[PDB]
Amino acid sequence: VLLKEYRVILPVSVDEYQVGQLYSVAEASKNETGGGEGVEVLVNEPYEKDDGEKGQYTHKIYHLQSKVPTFVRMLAPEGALNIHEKAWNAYPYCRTVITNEYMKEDFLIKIETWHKPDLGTQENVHKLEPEAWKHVEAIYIDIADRSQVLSKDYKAEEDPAKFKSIKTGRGPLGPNWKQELVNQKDCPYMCAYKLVTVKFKWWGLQNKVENFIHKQEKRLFTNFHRQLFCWLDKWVDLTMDDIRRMEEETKRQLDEMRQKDPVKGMTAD
Numbered sequence: 001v002l003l004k005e006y007r008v009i010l011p012v013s014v015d016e017y018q019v020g021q022l023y024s025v026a027e028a029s030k031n032e033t034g035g036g037e038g039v040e041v042l043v044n045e046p047y048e049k050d051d052g053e054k055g056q057y058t059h060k061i062y063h064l065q066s067k068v069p070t071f072v073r074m075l076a077p078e079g080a081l082n083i084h085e086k087a088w089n090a091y092p093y094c095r096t097v098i099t100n101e102y103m104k105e106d107f108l109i110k111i112e113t114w115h116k117p118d119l120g121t122q123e124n125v126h127k128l129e130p131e132a133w134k135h136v137e138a139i140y141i142d143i144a145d146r147s148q149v150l151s152k153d154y155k156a157e158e159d160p161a162k163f164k165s166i167k168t169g170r171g172p173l174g175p176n177w178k179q180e181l182v183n184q185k186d187c188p189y190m191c192a193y194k195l196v197t198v199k200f201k202w203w204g205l206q207n208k209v210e211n212f213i214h215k216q217e218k219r220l221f222t223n224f225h226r227q228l229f230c231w232l233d234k235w236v237d238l239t240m241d242d243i244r245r246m247e248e249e250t251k252r253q254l255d256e257m258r259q260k261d262p263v264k265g266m267t268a269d
């Protein structure tokens, strides 16, 4: 079991992120869906636990046959590659549990996130146990840093070091945009502390795949947030009410696209 916490500082407020994240997840899902693969939203309902925690529940399935590397592909029968995502989104807090029916208990990708109005300086925000938290590598993802992006993933239109929002005036993010957040009254900020736990108990592959999965998560978080910022003008004025409507349409769209369109998005690698 390999744990790492990815801290993503962003030039948006905690409240704005709640909308930007929902908007961006919708667009990112569609960009990867078609030809039978991609995202399928099964459940999207509001929930309330005994303790009173309220939030939004979603159950999705990521069909991943040809989008996964060959060493992963020739590892299980077709269809066995799909993974399920169940998330209890009680924003600012969220717990996401990803599973695989084939490996059952041997597989787990859990992402627990705390969205704080600070600059990523809170240690052990998920309040684990002292020693355990010591074995948690903390990694910072700088959405402005070109060297943190994979060459094949780069797209100038999704580069915040070149993007300037027309509606807010934020951007482009320079090499020192972070340290700058403290000088300007404008340009709000927050930090997503994403604790990722990966378990892949497979004889002889555990170490390789648990590390491979973290890299893909780091890669996803980097591209996702660079896109979220660059899409700032598309969602900053949306309300939570706009999102809900947009989500019900997205669900339909994902299904439609998945059956017609050919496979699209990030090719295996």
Ligand SMILES: CCCCCCCC/C=C\CCCCCCCC(=O)OC[C@H](COP(=O)(O)OCC[N+](C)(C)C)OC(=O)CCCCCCC/C=C\CCCCCCCC
Pocket (backbone or CB within 6 Å): 021, 025, 028, 029, 032, 038, 039, 058, 062, 064, 067, 068, 069, 072, 075, 076, 080, 081, 082, 083, 087, 089, 094, 095, 096, 098, 100, 102, 103, 107, 109, 111, 113, 213, 216, 217, 220, 221, 224, 266, 267, 268, 269
């Ligand atoms: C024997 C066989 C067993 C093996 C099984 C195969 C395992 C696959 C191996 C590697 C794959 C690792 C990459 C994980 C891909 C799944 C994406 C993922 O883990 O999503 C979760 C992340 C973090 O959770 P969250 O709480 O932040 O948000 C969700 C909660 N909510 C909605 C309330 C905000 O969500 C986010 O960052 C938001 C972005 C979500 C939307 C992106 C759509 C992705 C669709 C396709 C991905 C294509 C890439 C395939 C990788 C191939 C490698 C080359």
